[PDB]
Each structure stands twice: as C-alpha cells, then as structure tokens.
A = this chain, B = another copy of it.
C-alpha cells in the first residue's frame, strides 16, 4: 500500500539542512538568519530552487511568503497546505523551522516516488518570517495571511527595526513590497482557501525522546505574549554620585526581571513560563550610572487567563518598582497578547491514523512554542506533527534531530497530506 511504499532520502535531507545552515551571520555550529538580510535572501533562493526541482509552481506574495504548488486532479478545490519558516534567532540551531520547509519539499518528492496522485492540490508555504528578532513581530507572514489589518497598517506606517530601518525599506532591499499602491491586504487569505494546514516541526521539548516515541500529534498551541519595558533615571558619575541621590535604571530593570520570575511561579502551574531575554542599559559604560534600561519579556501559558494574570502582575510590579526606585516608567507596551489555537479534530484523527499505518509510536500533546500554525488555524483546520529532538534543546546550537526522526516526520506528513487530499 501507499504507507509501506513511502521512502525518504534521509542523508539527502540532512545534507540540505547542513547546506542551508551555511547561510548564517553566526559561525557554525550556531545559526543567525534574520528576515530580509542577505543571508535570508540566499536561503530563500536555495529553497525556491529545491521547490522548482521538485516540479512545484512557485509564487511569492507582497511580503515574501513563498508558495510551491503541486497541481491536483481537481485543482479548483481548496488545497492542502503545509510549511514552516527558515529564519533563525541569534545563535540558534539548524532544525527549528527548517525541518518543516525542507521536510515538506521532501514529502512532495516522497509522494511522487510512490506514484501518488493528489485530488486536492498540495501547496508548500515558506513563511516570510516567523521569529520576532528584527521588528519585534512574531509570525509576520502568517499573521498577514490570517488577515490582520492592524499589522498591515502598522507595517506600512510605523514599523522599524533596531537600526531604524523601516519594514518597507527592508522588504524592498530583499526584492519585495515594491508596489506603492498595496496596503498589504493583497496578502490576506479568505477563510477556507485551504482545506487544511499542516506543520512538521521538531518538538523543542524532551517528551517524545524521554518516552521513546516517534511522533507527537499536536492538539493545541500555548498562548503567547510579549512586552517591552523602559525605565528612565538621571544617570551621572558612578564614582561621585553618592548612593542616597541615585535613581538607578539598571537596578529597576534587575528588580523587574526578578519580579517576572516571581509572578510566573505564583501561578502554581508548571505550564506557565516567563523570560527576560533582552535587558539593555544606557549609556552602558562601567563608570556611568544607567539612566535608561530596556527589557523585553516573553510570557506564555496553555491557559490564556492564567497568563494574563502574570502580565497584569508584571505591570503592577513595574509601577511599584518605578515609584520605589524614583525612576520614570517611560514605556510599558504589550507588543502581542495572543490566544491559544486548537488543532482540528479530523486532522488529529488523520495524523494519528497515518502514524499507526506507518507503525510509528505516537502520543497527543500540546505545543509550548508558538508557530505559524497558530495563525493558520484562523484560516483553515490545522494540525502539527512533532518529531523528537535531542534533550529537547532548541534556540541554541545544541539543537538536534536525527535523520531517522526527520524521515519519520516526513513520512507522517506525506501520508497525512495524501489522506487530506482525498477528503
């Protein structure tokens, strides 16, 4: 049957993972690859070439989401879509995102080798960017596909990066958003344009590995939020300004970072997380008392209300700390505060059937990380396939998924796409 016929070029896929990792601003084994930079442009060209070699019809939208379609026997029907991202945060790994892009192309090649003939077309999406590194905006491509007018407006009017380069200027340097007449609504997909959307991804947790399982059938994605906070004080000379006269913006930031941890732990649930991954001091000189501090805070929970309580407490603490330290709370901005997504029950059923037919052990589980799937779920029924990764490591160069684990994920993706194409 179809399932028994599926065969993946596992070393070939690994070779592509390694080749793509060369497009990096960080030295190997780390990867850094940021939206619209030269390394991103090179990586896009590499992927588009692989899509062409796979016989896919390739197109791009106004912000650089890339689509590669295998036309079905009934091409007017909403297609079955799959895909992921290839951007990488600073000093991260080679597998996050990339497995779901290169692996989706491999799933096409696998199905073609088996002589599968899709009824509904299959389409691979390379999302233009999923990581928030450049503009503070996660899932930039999929948020637009899912029809965010607010985001489209912001991208055209106010959005800039840390070097004051605008979104539009960055896009144009990479070959996109050239048309002046587009408010970016051209990117929006109407609800139902895809029959379903699937994303293959490394688990980014140790559960499948610890339990000895091959496949996670993802049932939900946890609710993510992020915040930016700034404090301002008077600054001055570190040697000469006596302690009673200070209002140290760095100490306010230190206290807020510890308050974030405290409020997360106060939830009493191990599913709650919060992190201060960015903490910058100005002027940032050893002998200058910080007059401005800038924090960026990530916080999430599978339970939206429980997460929101953490956010409320963080704002309360920022105000309490500012008053105590006698500094100005000059910025407190919630950058995003998004609900969780639920995978579609029929997609879940088909995925689990596919794993069973392939003799692959599996469990149903939640995603802690967010993904493009979070926003694609607003447009069509969604599911995700998790594969194991070594010790759950992710967002660091120790991240690793074996050729066998990737091949298993590709087989499940191939078979689930096939099932949905004939639905």
B251 touches A239 (CB 8 A): no
A277's partner among B222, B238, B253, B368 (CB-CB below 8 A) is B238
A239's partner among B133, B261, B278, B370 (CB-CB below 8 A) is B370
A146 on interface, CB distance cutoff 8 Å: no
Q: How large is the interface on A (under 10, 10 to 19, 20 to 34, 35 or more residues)?
A: 35 or more
> Which of chain B's residues has its CB closest to A258's CB?
B254
Say how far A159's CB is from chain B's closest CB, in angstroms: 16
Q: How far is the CA of A253 from the CA of B290 in the complex (A)?
A: 15
B residues less than 8 Å from A242 (CB atoms): 270-271, 273
A241 on interface, CB distance cutoff 8 Å: yes
> Which of chain B's residues has its CB closest to A284's CB?
B278
Chain A 261-274 interface mask (CB, 8 Å, partner B; 1/0):
10011000011110
A224's partner among B131, B136, B239, B243 (CB-CB below 8 A) is B239
Given contacts A240-B394, A244-B270, A395-B238, contact A287 B257 (CB under 8 A): no
A226 on interface, CB distance cutoff 8 Å: yes
A298 on interface, CB distance cutoff 8 Å: yes
A91 on interface, CB distance cutoff 8 Å: yes
Say how far A189's CB is from chain B's closest CB, in angstroms: 25
B residues less than 8 Å from A283 (CB atoms): 89-92, 277, 395
Q: How far is the CA of A93 from the CA of B247 in the complex (A)?
A: 20
Q: How far is the CA of A132 from the CA of B89 in the complex (A)?
A: 32
A172 on interface, CB distance cutoff 8 Å: no
Which of A281-324 touch B at CB < 8 Å? 281-291, 296-298, 300
Q: How many copies does the complex hold?
A: 2
Q: How far is the CA of A327 from the CA of B255 in the complex (A)?
A: 19
Of listed A276, A283, A291, A298, residue having the most chain B CB within 10 A: A283
B residues less than 8 Å from A205 (CB atoms): 240
B residues less than 8 Å from A255 (CB atoms): 254, 258
A39 on interface, CB distance cutoff 8 Å: no
Q: How far is the CA of A270 from the CA of B240 in the complex (A)?
A: 11
A156 on interface, CB distance cutoff 8 Å: no
A121 on interface, CB distance cutoff 8 Å: no
Of listed A222, A271, A273, residue having the most chain B CB within 10 A: A273
Of listed A89, A264, A300, residue having the most chain B CB within 10 A: A89
A369 on interface, CB distance cutoff 8 Å: yes
B residues less than 8 Å from A289 (CB atoms): 275, 277, 395
Other A-B contacts than A254-B257, A278-B284, 19 sampled, CB-CB below 8 A, are A89-B288, A90-B284, A136-B286, A222-B239, A237-B369, A237-B394, A237-B395, A238-B277, A239-B273, A239-B298, A239-B300, A240-B394, A241-B273, A242-B273, A250-B257, A275-B289, A277-B288, A287-B298, A289-B395
27 pairs of residues in contact across A and B, judged by CB atoms under 8 Å: A89-B283, A90-B284, A92-B288, A132-B287, A138-B287, A222-B239, A224-B239, A234-B396, A235-B395, A240-B394, A242-B273, A243-B270, A244-B270, A248-B275, A250-B276, A251-B257, A254-B254, A254-B255, A255-B258, A258-B258, A277-B281, A277-B287, A277-B288, A278-B284, A278-B285, A279-B279, A285-B395
Chain A residues proximal to chain B, CB less than 8 Å: 89-92, 131-133, 136, 138, 204-205, 222, 224, 226, 234-244, 248, 250-251, 253-255, 257-258, 261, 264-265, 270-273, 275-279, 281-291, 296-298, 300, 368-370, 392-396
**Which 9 pairs from chain A and chain B are nearest by CB?**
A254-B254, A238-B275, A91-B283, A240-B368, A286-B296, A237-B394, A90-B283, A237-B395, A89-B285
